[PDB]
Amino acid sequence: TMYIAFILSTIFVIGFVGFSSKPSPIYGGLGLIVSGGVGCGIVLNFGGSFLGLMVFLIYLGGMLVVFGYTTAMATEMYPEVWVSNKTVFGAFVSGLMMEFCMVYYALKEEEVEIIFKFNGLGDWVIYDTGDSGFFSEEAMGIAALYSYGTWLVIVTGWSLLIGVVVIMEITRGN
Amino acid sequence: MPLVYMNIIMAFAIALAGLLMYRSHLMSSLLCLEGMMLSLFIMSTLIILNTHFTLANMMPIILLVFAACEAALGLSLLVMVSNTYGTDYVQNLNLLQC
Amino acid sequence: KTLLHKYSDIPEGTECHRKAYASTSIGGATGLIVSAYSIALKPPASFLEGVARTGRYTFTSAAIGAIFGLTSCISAQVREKPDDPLNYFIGGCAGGLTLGARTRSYGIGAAACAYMGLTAALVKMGQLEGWQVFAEPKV
Amino acid sequence: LLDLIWLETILPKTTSFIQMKMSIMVSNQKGLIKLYFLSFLITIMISMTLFNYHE
Amino acid sequence: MNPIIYTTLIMTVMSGTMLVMISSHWLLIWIGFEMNLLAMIPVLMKNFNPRATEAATKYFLTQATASMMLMMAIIINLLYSGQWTITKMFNPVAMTMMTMALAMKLGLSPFHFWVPEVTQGISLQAGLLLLTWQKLAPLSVLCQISQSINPNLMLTMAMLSILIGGWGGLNQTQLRKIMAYSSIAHMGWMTAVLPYNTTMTILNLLIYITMTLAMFMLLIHSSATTTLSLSHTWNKMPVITSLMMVTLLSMGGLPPLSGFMPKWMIIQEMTKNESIIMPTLMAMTALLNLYFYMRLAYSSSLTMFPSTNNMKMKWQFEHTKQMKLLPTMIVLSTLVLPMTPALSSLN
Amino acid sequence: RQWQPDVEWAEQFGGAVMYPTKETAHWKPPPWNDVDPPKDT
Amino acid sequence: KFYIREPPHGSPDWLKVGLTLGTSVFLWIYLIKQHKEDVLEYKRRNGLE
Amino acid sequence: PFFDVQKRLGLDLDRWMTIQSAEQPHKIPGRCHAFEKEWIECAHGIGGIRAE
Amino acid sequence: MMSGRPGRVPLQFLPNEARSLPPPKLTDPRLVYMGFLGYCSGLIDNAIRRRPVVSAGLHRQLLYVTSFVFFGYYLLKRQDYMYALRDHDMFAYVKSHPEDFPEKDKKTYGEILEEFHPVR
Amino acid sequence: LQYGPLAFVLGERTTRKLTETSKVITVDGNICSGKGRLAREIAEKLGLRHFPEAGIHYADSTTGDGKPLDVQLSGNCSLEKFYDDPKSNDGNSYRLQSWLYASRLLQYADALEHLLSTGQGVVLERSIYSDFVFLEAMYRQGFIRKQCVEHYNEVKKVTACEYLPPHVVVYVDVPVPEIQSRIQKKGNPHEMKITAAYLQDIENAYKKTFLPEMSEKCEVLQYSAREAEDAEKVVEDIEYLKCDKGPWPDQDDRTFHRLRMLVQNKLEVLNYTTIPVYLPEITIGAHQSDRVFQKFTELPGRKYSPGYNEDVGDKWIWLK
Ligand SMILES: Nc1nc2c(ncn2[C@@H]2O[C@H](COP(=O)(O)OP(=O)(O)OP(=O)(O)O)[C@@H](O)[C@H]2O)c(=O)[nH]1
Ligand SMILES: [Mg+2]
């Protein structure tokens, strides 16, 4: 129970290795949604309740769902399987071992310098000490989209309407 | 930096490598793009919650919606390519060499 | 840069074995990069064919580096002239001759002798006179 | 020997030949997304490695 | 497409570019790039052939990958500074990521492969938009963050762009691929002086956009996309081919034409910084671009290729539509060299 | 009269590339109207 | 007349001709007045007169 | 911005999310509010070169 | 260089401190070349549109000329103001930093020993 | 205000003009089959526009003053020369074949223009879709080189693809002996040299390529010479056709706008008829090209542009 965010992050990276080794896209999507679930859990452990539930509802139940639906239509006659290629196994194995080596090095050394400097002193350590009062600071920051973020709403809504128009232009096929 | 950040940035690097190293299917590359976006979302969320940048709490929402719009566009492109060739194989997208 | 630092800090016309090793390392690294790009953009028909192409490019470049280093350093220490661009010119021409041997063609060998010798002499001149390839902005 | 052959060979003919050869190497590409993005991975890795940029 | 929908998509492309150029916040700059790409993809597929679809797909893949890398650079910068303002980057690897992303968006040499194929695969109007308007946003970002770029990385990419644009364009008989390789070389010229003087980058961009607009409008006026099709244009409208020849000479940077101004100013500004070898290399390399420009001029205006019998039909007909601002674009692309000191207005 | 290009001179520029090698022997000039025929239905 | 079809540019576009002449005259008048007031503003800022 | 339309038109389009020491909802403080404020008040108006 | 200059208000083609410089003369050679550029644009417009290049659409060629001169006058003002600003800042910086710009001690060629190189 | 994006945006739609009799009808048949009578009475009684068959000087008729220009400046080919020496070394057979195909492309564009701009239907005598019958007939008789039919296929594929087929394909059926007797009846000495093998090849191309392939995208109406004189019966069968085949039913204003844009632009219509495919029968040398172009430019009203030719009675050049 002492370490929860680290198992979650290691599983996150494992799922990333799994779907980025690119088996047939249905198993890649399964790995992506496993990664998304554990990442939603990660941000739940950081106090990002609304953001993680957004991950769930819109990413895993929306965007993914649509991805798997579209894969179920444009696939191979025998939709492929993970095992069918030695390349998938090699990529997944290399990614898993580079995960294991670096997490072991960071755990037992705490001063790795792979591009960035890292210290696995813990993950609870960086949390600050204070009271947030009678509201969720995350929800207040996100609800400010309609009061502070007028410009953001304007450009995002315009881009979504343009996205509808754009999709209907491209898919017409003439 | 804490080791969760290490693993999140590592996930982004793995998604980038998986996208740059192609295979036959286009959908696999699009899923790698989606993984890159998801790792960006989690990194942004961790940074924003940790430093209590309250107004920046909305930034991950905007990132998610815009990247999903791009994903819809890419899915439509894949569907057009498949209707042309019956598959989403990138090796059929080579007739611009001449 | 450490690959180039180890070549640069050892003085000219001394410790010819060390300088030859450093130039061989530079050659092998450059040949590895060109092999990576060639394998990426013009893929082989098999893994072994790619390994063969990689080894061919790498040995050609490493042999050019080793020959340039040996000839440049030895002609520097033999003549006692470590600041003369002529030793680097001889090195570049010997590198061109071994590139011509690697491609087994006298025309490539002669043209490469001229071009690489002039290039190496220019490099020596730029080292002596502080020419900048990428000059940092100042004004 | 000099004007029609060697003075031609040294400066203009050999330079033109080199430019033509480089043009053939650069221009003739498979037109494959896969090879282009593999080369992109090579370039990205090189910029974050021996080519001292991120440091 | 519907004329209203096409106008809206064009306006959305320009508004994404403007969002990039008017924002102080990195998230809004990323939003502008996203909006530009979203609106740009349909205009590439306006004709809708498999070539157009493949061009759009390759464009989308490169631009989306670049955008994700740009967002990662922004997130690393925020991780180390907590700053969203577009200013110097506070992290070196974030700066490298951002530089590579912006170069991939621009199509610089190590990321140049998409430019020739996409330009060939789309129509001349789409290519005109692609090679003129799409350069503004990444270059403006680069000019804003220029004080923190690694000069070695940028200069490497610019020199490679010049070399590859020169060599790749040597082998082309397709006008769109020739335009794309010329664009790669000119982007290299723009980005070489970027570490030293962003005003020179803006000047070179304006001159290049003028020349590219003039050349693409002449091609659209001619309806020619191959060098042999252009070789018939003398027997229909020789004024177009003579104007095209002077424009190609301008593109080659021949004095006293307008295309010589950016090269001359950039060489001067570089020598001001003890940069002598690189400007000499760049000027020498541009002779390749001038060589295939001169090949096009030979086939188009300076000599007369065989025509066809069916060309007598076209003689009795005028153009239904007329290219806007083409005479102005032609005069600006050829005759403006005496006005060079006005470049200080860009300061 | 002045020499002007004939068909043999014009057809140097009508190929797929400007410098035909073996690796581009299979290259054909692209369609006139930029459209490729539909494949097997 | 001579042509079977009516030429689009067979008669002057009187609205466009008038607009062109008027906008040119306005541009010249505005330029001259701006230069006059600009010389005046320069002379009074610099104390010349 | 490349074209500072916001500072010419007096509009606040995106400057409100640009720092964590800007005004926040319910006056919730940034974690590094004082540190950012001190750095900004040091670096104000002397240019990036001097401020570095 | 000039982007972050103090007082530099956005999107302002001529700032109000430019009104202290002399406006360019009406017969300014650069302005006349601007008009010539407009005239060439009109001629080329006649050529491309397949009209008699010299005598067709005198209102259009005339408008080309006057619009080119109109833009050129303001371009000349902005260019001259930018160069005036450049000189202003250069002199201010030399004044504020006397140690960087010392008063060089002048000497005559009768006390300066220059090396003679024979041509022979 | 030429039909453009601004016209279509406000209120310019073509479906509000399209009707039940807004159809393009092509009448067809071998030589001396009498397509003229059938087409002309069909147009007159069905209230459509007739287009006489596209000749060498059709383009000269739709531009300038509508009068034919010299064969040197327009056409550069002859039909009498083809009937006298069909296997001549000039390449006049395929030069004529390409010129009249280009004239047919121009006429199809002009007819679709009238239909899409006014709403009235048109009737044509032959079209782009039945021009190949003569090309194959000439090929079987060994007139054109095999190189010269590949080029024809290229041009037809890249140009005719852009347009909508006829609603109705009326064909007049006459046997070869009767056609021969009609040619011998009208007395044209050049027509008198037409071999029965040529006419038989034309009829075979009609029956085995043209009529079957129209049958899947239009309704084909075949009459022999007996039922072709009763134009009432022909138009009665024209009015009884469902016309639920081909691309015409699935046409909306968006596609009609693009078709009107292409069809109104004559230089875009003829774009690919001058592809750089160098065949001796149609390639023009640079000296001859330049000379003939200058002589064309010297024509009255042809130098500058319509309305800018003072030498032909054009005023106000300096205000235009
Ligand atoms: N070579 C050639 N000749 C053509 C072509 N189209 C029409 N002609 C000629 O056009 C001439 C005009 O006569 P036709 O239109 O065939 O027939 P007609 O005498 O009007 O009689 P009907 O067909 O009954 O109306 C004939 O000599 C045809 O051979 C073509 O594509 N190629
Ligand atoms: Mg007929």
SSE arrangement:
This is part of a larger assembly, with ten protein chains of ten kinds.
Chain A: H1 5-20, H2 25-45, H3 49-71, H4 86-109, H5 137-143, H6 150-170
Chain B: H1 3-20, H2 26-50, H3 59-85
Chain F: H1 7-10
The structure holds guanosine-5'-triphosphate (GTP) and magnesium ion.
Report the major sheet of chain F.
Answer: none
In this structure, how is the largest beta sheet of chain I organized? none
Helix-strand sequence of chain F: H
Number of domains of chain I: 1
CA-based gyration radius of chain I = 25 Å
**Helix content percent band of chain F:** under 10%
Small ligands present: guanosine-5'-triphosphate, magnesium ion
Could you state the order of secondary-structure elements of chain I as H and E? Answer: HH
Calculate the terminal CA-CA distance of chain F, rounded to whole Å: 56 Å
Apparent shape of chain I: flat
Query: Biggest interface: chains and residue counts?
Result: A-B, 82 and 63 residues
Protein name (chain I): NADH dehydrogenase [ubiquinone] 1 subunit C2
Subcellular location (chain I): Mitochondrion inner membrane
GO biological process, one term (chain I): mitochondrial electron transport, NADH to ubiquinone
Organism (chain I): Sus scrofa
Describe the structure.
The structure is cut from a larger assembly and holds 10 protein chains of 10 kinds. With 55 residues, chain D is mostly helical. Chain D has helices at 2-27, 33-47. Chain D starts with a helix and ends in an 8-residue tail after the last helix. In chain E, helix 10 crosses helix 16. Chain F is elongated, with a radius of gyration of 15 Å. Chain I has 120 residues and is mainly α. Chain I contains 2 helices and no strands. At the A-B interface, helix 1, helix 2, helix 3, helix 4 and helix 5 of A face helix 1, helix 2 and helix 3 of B. The complex binds guanosine-5'-triphosphate (GTP) and magnesium ion. The site of magnesium ion (MG) has 5 residues of chain J, from helix 2. Chain J: GTP 4 binds at residues 32-36, 83, 97, 104, 126, 134, 186.
Relevant terms:
part of a larger assembly; 10 chains; E: 347 residues; mainly alpha; globular; H: 52 residues; 3 helices; 0% strand; flat; binds guanosine-5'-triphosphate; binds magnesium ion; electron transport; in-situ cryo-EM structure; mammalian; mitochondria; respiratory supercomplex
Compact description:
The structure is cut from a larger assembly and holds 10 protein chains of 10 kinds. Chain E is 71% helix and 1% strand. With 347 residues, chain E is an all-alpha fold.
